[PDB]
């Protein structure tokens, strides 16, 4: 049992990798996870970076990297017992670190098969959230978007619902791995829960109604599903928000007597700035749509109906 070990910068149990190092997929292996972990822990701790071309296929070369990191850590834990203040323990991971952490968790969780990551990141920055908010990802897969958002924001709670057996199972793991690795790096996340469920179900009806921020990746959703979703969103509170990959109402909705009951009567819809250098499987750059529950649109229309002048114009 030849092995490599990395010490936690905050004294959690060490990460232990068997030799020879496992490959995760055609683009990810333990070797580079190790290397990358070291680089990121160095970003967490400037002194560690100060204190610190490799052959990822030589055990001795890789052990010289680990020992060197591990000694630098010991040395840093000593420095903190002195007057130097330890790394503050309650912080959120930088975006960079979070990217690594999520890659790492994926690798250790999903054993059989994240440009989204960058998009989600853009959305986290545009969509201000606070401790008032409840976030849900509808059709949450293995959970990566809940985890990312839960790591980055103050929402009071974050949920993901997913109905298929496979992804839901991985999600149970992704949850354990995530908490484990976040403890390893000494970072906080907001509360979250990843659940099995169908978000079209009667329980979810009320839950959708009380959620203030919904992400849903509905591009390939069919008419029936998008329509059922519209009927769920109709019950949401003023200022509720939905971010999606396909808009649930037209962007220039003009309210009139034929379309009174359409969901565009009750929501502002905007196209969100795309991410430069993004390109979907289609070939077109990726755009995203923000809907904000705003029932003043319907109010003003009905006001207008009462005003004979404004009534004639329309008419």
Ligand X SMILES: CC(C)N(CCCNC(=O)Nc1ccc(C(C)(C)C)cc1)C[C@H]1O[C@@H](n2cnc3c(N)ncnc32)[C@H](O)[C@@H]1O
Binding residues for S-adenosyl-L-methionine: 114-115, 135-144, 162, 198-199
Write down the number of H helices and E strands in the chain: 11, 11
- As measured in angstroms, the least distance from the Cβ of 196 to ligand X is 9
Per CB under 6 A, contacts with ligand X among 179-198 are 198
- As measured in angstroms, the least distance from the Cβ of 104 to ligand X is 18
- As measured in angstroms, the least distance from the Cβ of 118 to ligand X is 10
Residue whose tokens read 């700035």: 273
Determine, following the binding rule CB under 6 A, whether residue 244 of this chain makes contact with ligand X.
yes
Whole-Å CA distances, 290 to 101, 152, 172, 246, 295: 28, 19, 30, 10, 16
Interface segment toward ligand X; rule CB under 6 A; list 64-72, 83-91, 135-143, 232-240: 135-143
Determine, following the binding rule CB under 6 A, whether residue 129 of this chain makes contact with ligand X.
no
| Contacts with ligand X, 150-169, as mask; x by CB under 6 A | -----------xxxx--x--
Determine, following the binding rule CB under 6 A, whether residue 247 of this chain makes contact with ligand X.
no
Cα 79 to its chain centre, rounded Å, is 35
Q: Strands, DSSP E only, in 20-156?
A: 23-25, 28-29, 134-138
Q: In what order do the strands lie in the sheet with 241-244?
A: 192-196, 157-162, 134-138, 213-216, 241-244, 288-293, 267-272
Structure tokens at 30: 């333990």
Determine, following the binding rule CB under 6 A, whether residue 124 of this chain makes contact with ligand X.
no
- As measured in angstroms, the least distance from the Cβ of 252 to ligand X is 21
Determine, following the binding rule CB under 6 A, whether residue 139 of this chain makes contact with ligand X.
yes
Q: Is 215 helix (H, G, I), strand (E, B) or coil?
A: strand
Per CB under 6 A, contacts with ligand X among 64-123 are 116, 119-120, 123
Structure tokens at 86: 């330890």
Under a CB-based contact definition with an 8 Å cutoff, are residues 204 and 235 in contact?
no
Number of residues that bind ligand X (CB under 6 A): 24
Kindly tell me the sign of the dihedral angle through the C-alpha atoms of 121, 122, 127, 128.
positive
| Nearest to ligand X of 8, 95 (CB atom) | 95
Q: Furthest-apart CA pair in the chain: how many Å?
A: 86
- Position among 93, 217, 242, 255 found at the interface with ligand X (CB under 6 A): 217
Nearest residue (beta carbon) to ligand X: 139
Contact set with ligand X (CB under 6 A): 116, 119-120, 123, 137, 139-141, 145, 161-164, 167, 198-200, 215-217, 243-245, 288
């Amino acid at each position: 049992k030849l092995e490599l070990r990395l010490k936690s910068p905050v004294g959690a149990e060490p990460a232990v990798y068997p030799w020879p190092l496992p490959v995760y997929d055609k683009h990810h292996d333990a070797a580079h996870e190790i290397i990358e972990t070291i680089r990121w822990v160095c970003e967490e701790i400037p002194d560690l970076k100060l204190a610190m071309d490799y052959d990822t296929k030589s055990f001795e070369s890789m052990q010289r990297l680990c020992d060197k990191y591990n000694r630098a850590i010991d040395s840093i834990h000593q420095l903190w017992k002195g007057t130097t203040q330890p790394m503050k323990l309650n912080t959120r991971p930088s975006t960079g670190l979070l990217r690594h952490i999520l890659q790492q968790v994926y690798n250790h969780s999903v054993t059989d098969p994240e440009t989204s990551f960058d998009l989600v990141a853009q959305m986290i920055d545009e969509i201000k959230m606070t401790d008032d908010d409840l976030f849900v990802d509808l059709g949450s897969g293995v959970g990566q978007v809940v985890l990312q958002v839960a790591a980055a924001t103050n929402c009071k709670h974050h949920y993901g619902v997913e109905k298929a057996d496979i992804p839901a199972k991985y999600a149970e793991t992704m949850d354990r791995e995530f908490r484990k690795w976040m403890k390893w790096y000494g970072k906080k996340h907001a509360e979250y829960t990843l659940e099995r469920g169908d978000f079209l179900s009667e329980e979810w009806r009320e839950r959708i109604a009380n959620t203030s921020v919904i992400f849903v990746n509905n591009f390939a959703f069919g008419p029936e599903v998008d329509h059922q979703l519209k009927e769920r969103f109709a019950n949401m509170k003023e200022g509720g928000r939905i971010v999606s990959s396909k808009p649930f109402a037209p962007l220039n909705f003009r309210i009139n007597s034929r379309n009174l009951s359409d969901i565009g009567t009750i929501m502002r819809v905007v196209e969100l700035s795309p991410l430069k250098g993004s390109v979907s499987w289609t070939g077109k750059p990726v755009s995203y749509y923000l809907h904000t529950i705003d029932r003043t649109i319907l109010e003003n229309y009905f006001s207008s109906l009462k005003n004979p002048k404004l009534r004639e114009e329309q008419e």
